[PDB]
A paper describes a structure:
A key component in the generation of cellular energy is the F1Fo ATP synthase, a biological rotary motor that converts proton motive force (pmf) to adenosine tri-phosphate (ATP) in both oxidative phosphorylation and photophosphorylation. The enzyme is based on two rotary motors, termed F1 and Fo, that are coupled together by two stalks: a central rotor stalk and a peripheral stator stalk.
The three catalytic β subunits in the present study were identified as containing β1 (βDP); MgADP, β2 (βE); ADP and β3 (βTP); [name]. Masked 3D classification focusing on the central rotor highlighted sub-states in which the εCTD adopted either a condensed down conformation or an extended half-up conformation. In this study we observed the εCTD in two conformations, a half-up and a down sub-state. When the εCTD is in the up or half-up conformation, the εCTH1 binds to the γ subunit, clamping the central rotor together. This clamping would stabilize the central stalk in a closed position, increasing the stiffness of the rotor which, in turn, has the potential to impede enzyme turnover by decreasing the flexibility of the intact enzyme.
Residue numbers in the entry:
A (entry chain a): 4 to 269
B (entry chain H): 3 to 103
C (entry chain M), D (entry chain R), E (entry chain J), F (entry chain S), G (entry chain L), H (entry chain N), ...: 3 to 77
M (entry chain X), N (entry chain Y): 1 to 52
The structure:
Amino acid sequence: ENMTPQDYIGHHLNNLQLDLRTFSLVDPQNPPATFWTINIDSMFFSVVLGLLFLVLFRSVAKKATSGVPGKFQTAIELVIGFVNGSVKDMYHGKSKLIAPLALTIFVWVFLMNLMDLLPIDLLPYIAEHVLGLPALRVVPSADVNVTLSMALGVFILILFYSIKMKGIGGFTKELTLQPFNHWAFIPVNLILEGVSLLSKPVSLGLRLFGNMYAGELIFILIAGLLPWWSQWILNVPWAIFHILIITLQAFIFMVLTIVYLSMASE
Amino acid sequence: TYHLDVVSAEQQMFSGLVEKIQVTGSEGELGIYPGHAPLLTAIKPGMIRIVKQHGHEEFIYLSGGILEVQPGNVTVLADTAIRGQDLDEARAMEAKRKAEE
Amino acid sequence: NLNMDLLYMAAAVMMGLAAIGAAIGIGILGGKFLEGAARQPDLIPLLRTQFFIVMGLVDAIPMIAVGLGLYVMFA
Amino acid sequence: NLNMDLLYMAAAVMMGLAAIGAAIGIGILGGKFLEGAARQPDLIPLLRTQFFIVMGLVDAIPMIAVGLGLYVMFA
Amino acid sequence: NLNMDLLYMAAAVMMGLAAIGAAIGIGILGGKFLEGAARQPDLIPLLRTQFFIVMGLVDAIPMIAVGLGLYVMFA
Amino acid sequence: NLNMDLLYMAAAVMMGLAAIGAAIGIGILGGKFLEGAARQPDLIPLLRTQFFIVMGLVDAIPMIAVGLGLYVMFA
Amino acid sequence: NLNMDLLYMAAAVMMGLAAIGAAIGIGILGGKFLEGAARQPDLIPLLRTQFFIVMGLVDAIPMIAVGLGLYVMFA
Amino acid sequence: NLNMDLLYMAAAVMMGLAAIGAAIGIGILGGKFLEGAARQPDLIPLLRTQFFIVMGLVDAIPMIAVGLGLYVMFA
Amino acid sequence: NLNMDLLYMAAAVMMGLAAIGAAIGIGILGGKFLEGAARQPDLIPLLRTQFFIVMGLVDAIPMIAVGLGLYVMFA
Amino acid sequence: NLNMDLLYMAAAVMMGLAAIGAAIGIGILGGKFLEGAARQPDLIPLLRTQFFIVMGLVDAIPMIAVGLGLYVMFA
Amino acid sequence: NLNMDLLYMAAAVMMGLAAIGAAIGIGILGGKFLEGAARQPDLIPLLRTQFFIVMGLVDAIPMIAVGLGLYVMFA
Amino acid sequence: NLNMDLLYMAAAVMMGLAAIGAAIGIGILGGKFLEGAARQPDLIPLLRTQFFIVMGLVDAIPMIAVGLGLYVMFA
Amino acid sequence: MNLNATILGQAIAFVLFVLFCMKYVWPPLMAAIEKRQKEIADGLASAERAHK
Amino acid sequence: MNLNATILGQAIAFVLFVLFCMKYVWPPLMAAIEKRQKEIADGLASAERAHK
């Protein structure tokens, strides 16, 4: 096995893409021949995590009662406590969609990130040496396209909710008069306020991605460069810290979503 | 406009609704416009300037005391005579002298 | 030739300084916002409105340097 | 060659420095305003209009640094 | 060939400015939050929702400069 | 004939440092103007005329620095 | 060739800036905590817990820039 | 040869540090004057004399730098 | 030309900035501690333990950055 | 040749940093004198005695720096 | 041989940064100790001990950077 | 030959940084002495002795760095 | 790194999970909560007129 | 180089990671759960007696 430490490290930084023109898997060498080249590993892990939230919750959703809850049900209704507690004060309008929007973002974003603590080489081994797969990595959020798809989803929602709840007639006024309000500045005003809007979803996408990308890379290096005794003592303190990061990024994305929309509609 | 009361332990010096005042605080001058921030401080001996509502400007001498503010209601707790720890210590000695007699 | 990297790094310096101006300007504006809230929570729903106007200007210059940094990357 | 490559280096670094000045400065002046509003909210209109006068002078020097920064970008 | 190395360098300075900009900005903002909590511990959940309205804006421009820093790393 | 590469650089660095110096210096001053205004609004007319008097001094060296920036930029 | 060691100079800048950004930004935050802790000493956990939230984000970005410092040292 | 361009950059960098050091120094000094002046109208004429005396000490070393800046602009 | 001496220079900038970040951050932190001591002499053995726990979060990034500079003394 | 330029450029940073260091140091020290003077004007003559005495400590280190800068410029 | 001057630019930046990092850091710490002393004279003998504790930590990290300052003279 | 004037150029950098460290550290320290002195002038003789102790620690580390600057100038 | 069609592939997966929890998970749970919040309110409310 | 050392490294790390979690992190989870669960017990007690 001729993988030098630098070369071993490379295989974890490489994805398992398709190519729709050839209908074929990418090997660890060949390039993306076209945009139509979906990242199978990021999606496959991302949807299985989604189902094991939705199935567990819908099992209890069918069964919940006004008595003392079952202990597992108690944690579900408690995380509903955190969710509803945030929604309950930051949102003030009628809309239904806000609450399940925030919930499905929070718990699903977390599930992606919780998988990163799973041993970095183990599951790629069952990828390569069992089912014959040329590469893997085990954190959906560490691939940019998932974070952009959700954050550009929230961007759609910002446009949609804002135009719904104050119309274009005032939306144009805000996007053009502000911040100086005096009519000569309007052309220069819109430039600054436009790219200010687009900086909102971008802040979601980049921050979330960057923490989980840079999270996994440290585990790649921990595995790749070191003897066993020094891998465990360096990995323990990093797990304590990465706990905190993988929770906070889920919480921040939730809160920021609600705040960004609230700021436009209310 | 705000309801101001200037009071002392013996008598209530002044009261009513007021457009603004200027006051010599312990640290410096302060102006109470309508709905000013909550405040607590000691105030220095001297004239203070009142402008009552409908603009009737006036001077009140105070021998000192405490100022408090909150947006709807404000009051000054004025002392009658110049207060000093040294002067009060002198009165405390004076008080003992009588006890001996 | 090397001149292609030095025009790229020109975007990098434009971005770098402009990011500190906007981050700390918003942070000092934001820090005094919290002192207003620390005294008087009933003011904070008012204070969010005036904060967002003043923060709007703090972006106005750095956002110009942000966009030109994006253009100079592509061009 | 080098004259046009370095033209990129100058206009970008000038705007980066000007984006620091024009955003730190009115952030500081932003925090004192937002405190003064939390002090005396009958005077948020009076403070805001007073605050605009002060801000215009702050911006004046940095705006010229963007002005030269685009003029070197155009020429 | 120097073209490769100086692109590596241009990301590293741009990255350090964005790291300082974010870390200082939310440190300042967080300090006033902890003063508010020590002064007024009944309101700390209310202040927590205020502190996070502001924190995201401080991060926004430094994160753009990280986005260009990682693209100049990647390309 | 390289020499104009540094002539664009010399105008940029001196204007940038003057843009920071001016905008921070009157930015610090303008905050203390707002503190004095909120302390005694009957003296915003006296403190605003005083603020203009003081800030005339504060900008003076940066005002010469922008003037040399124009000179080196054109010539 | 030198090229591998030029990248060591890039990682050195990037990690050093991160070390300033980290330790200043938390030192501001920790100072407001310890002054508050002397005034409000029953509730030092309530300050501590919130303090560790702010610490988490403050260190996270310098941890990235140090990561890129690790990366570029290996190249 | 280079002797023309470097001297402008040489005067530019030295003039830049002087411009900051001046405008910050009296900015700090002039701010505390406005706070002290708002404290005490009786003192603002008295304190005005002290503002000018103390300002004369701050501006000396920057004036050595900008004086040498013109000397190098000529020579 | 200078390959080995440039990695020794890379450890010089890295070891220097790392010294700044640490020294200031715990200097600020200790200053705010000594105001607590100078006011509440009954709390000091508690406060000191809180000072060390916070200081245990301050020094980490500096202590990484000196590490890669000493590793560049292995290099 | 390089040798003349390096001598005068070494002198320009010596004066540039000495100009900042003294201007900020006296500006800070002077601001505390102007606040104190507003507190009680009969102190201002007593305060000048302490202000000039302590300013001599501040001045002594930068006065080494400008002497050695001029000596090395002349040498 | 050119390797010699790269040791001295390395030696100058390592030592010069470390000299700033310590000198500001203990300077800030010393200022809060003095007004603490001006508040509470009977604590100053206690506060002398407490000051020296924090001084050891602020020295500890720059002491690494000056030690390498010897090793670059050894190099 | 490039060597001698680079060696003195880097030595002057090491001196210039240490001069700011000293100038600002006593400046910051000196402000808290003068404003504390202004409250209670009978302390100013007592406080001066306290000034000279604290300043005695501050001016150890820069004065070493200036002493090395002279030692590198010697030979 | 790679600009990629995964950005569309995730848009389809996200909306279907949002609909799964909206129309089948949140209303059942939150109704059981708000019906419990009411029920406990009756206990104090019953006693409110019992002593009074 | 050998890579088999990664099996021992990642095994030992993940055990110690669980040791910290169980002893410090599961108790607050279960306790906020018990603290939440108590509201139903008080609510049922107060509703039972007040219907009585």
